[PDB]
A paper describes a structure:
Escherichia coli bacteriophage T7, a member of Podoviridae, has been used as a model for understanding the DNA packaging mechanism common to tailed phages and related dsDNA viruses.
Subsequently, a 7 Å resolution asymmetric reconstruction of the mature phage with a portal-tail complex at one of the 12 icosahedral vertices was obtained using the symmetry-mismatch reconstruction method. The portal-tail complex was reconstructed at the same resolution of 3.8 Å, although the core structure was still smeared. Another two independent local reconstructions focused on the portal and tail, respectively, yield the structures of the portal and tail at the same resolution of 3.8 Å, suggesting that the portal interacts firmly with the tail. Twelve copies of adaptor protein gp11 assemble around the bottom of the portal forming a ring-like structure and serving as the base for the assembly of a hexameric tube consisting of six copies of nozzle protein gp12. The dsDNA is embraced by the 12 tunnel loops in the portal, which have a weaker density probably due to its asymmetric interaction with the dsDNA groove. This dsDNA density terminates abruptly at the interface between the dodecameric ring of gp11 and hexameric nozzle of gp12. The clip tilts toward the portal axis, which probably triggers the disassociation of the terminase complex, followed by the assembly of the tail proteins.
Residue numbers in the entry:
A (entry chain Q), C (entry chain S): 3 to 196
B (entry chain R): 2 to 196
The structure:
Amino acid sequence: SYDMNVETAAELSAVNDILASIGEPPVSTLEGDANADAANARRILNKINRQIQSRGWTFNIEEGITLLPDVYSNLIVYSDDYLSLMSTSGQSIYVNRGGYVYDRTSQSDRFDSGITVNIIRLRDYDEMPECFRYWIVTKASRQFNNRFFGAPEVEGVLQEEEDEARRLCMEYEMDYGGYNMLDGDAFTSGLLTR
Amino acid sequence: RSYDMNVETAAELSAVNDILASIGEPPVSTLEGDANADAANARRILNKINRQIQSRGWTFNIEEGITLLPDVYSNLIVYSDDYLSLMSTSGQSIYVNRGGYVYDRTSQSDRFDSGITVNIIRLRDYDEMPECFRYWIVTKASRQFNNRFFGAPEVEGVLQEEEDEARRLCMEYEMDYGGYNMLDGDAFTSGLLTR
Amino acid sequence: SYDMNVETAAELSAVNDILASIGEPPVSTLEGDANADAANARRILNKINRQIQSRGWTFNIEEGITLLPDVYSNLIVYSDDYLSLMSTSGQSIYVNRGGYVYDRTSQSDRFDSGITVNIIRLRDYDEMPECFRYWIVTKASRQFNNRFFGAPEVEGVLQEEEDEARRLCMEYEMDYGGYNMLDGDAFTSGLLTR
């Protein structure tokens, strides 16, 4: 259940801003001193990054990919990287069992030659658009304010700020998905056929 | 320092860390060596709440008709504490425990051969859970561990808003994952649309 | 009027959680130390288990069983185990008198060859579904919080919590009973005969 044992310059600027949320100064590099101030600020980033991924968003969802079994076992590892696994159409079948995909209708584990699913893959603080990269910080900037320096007046401003941020995030995909009522969907696209 | 450097931890351990971050205090490294109430406190409140989130609802949790098999010699079926809720398939469910064993409350009997067909909610770990719920199992535990122990009203009044937002994301999950249909997939009004 | 002079491991974890409700740390075994903290927590569990049974719920109600008198006496013991005793149809006849069932219409006590009733049998903290096993704890987590460590803020959260627990309990039998308006009842099942 993924570890933060590597470092990145673009991820470093996020940890600075989470430390700004208390009022703490920058940490120059995340190689480490003894401070729980910068250690908790990095974990609350990772703990919230896996929420923002767990939602929603349309670039995050990989429409039908194929997961392939180890031919000799034969099963597919359902890793903690995979945040949410559903099926393509409806009445999704798969769920983990021991860390492995498992049919809850076919009563079976072992199957050959693949599946087609929608995986939300877990990505970094990088591999994210800048709308969300703000909101991953400023949502972390609330729970890091609430767990260590819990001043009610600097949180009550920040709650208004992360809500503003999430709105800009919801502004993003509505454009980015480009979705359509009457011309792009599954049902009422078929009705407009003359 | 290094890259690429892929590595994983216990999801059970990191959940106990987030409970300890929520009350407000430094991360505890390990769980075993049964010292530190805070590691027994946070892990019990995790387990005590994981068995609620399973006790509800959710559709991957419900195993549609499985068979439970008695011994040939006794002949009864053990109804364990692991089985959270046991109902029948259709309606006017018959089964209920009696000494830890399943029991007909209509056939007035305990002993039957050749099995049943039921809906068991099986209890699973903190793992064997999707990530939407793994969040909400923590942040609901982050409230009852805050309430029962760090009894400051302002930290829970924040966190109560947070676990409710978690539950909505959880409620969002199966609505997709079940993919349920009003007029085409159900028991009654699927039959009415037949031409 | 049933005593808690036996012990159970699954019942032990309930007493732990009632002790968590103050903020007190666990008791390992219920064999006993001097503390009234664990002794009052075990009693308030038993005192509330006999309420949740006294309600309602449909697995709890045993539809018509037979109680059988001692052929030589001849009466039926109405024990304190029996929480509520009604008749099958309506205008129920039976009520205790000295600890014994008694007709309040036939003016009599002694009768031969049995009855047919709806007994709510008192069961343990075990022999309960998990929805209720939660709510038997978290209702006990209020009356144990009010009687011994009564901070008003830790009760005010818990009252919201036991209410949410009660709703999950109320959700249970609505499924588990599977009750039907127009196809399963006594009156308007008979109306729909064609």
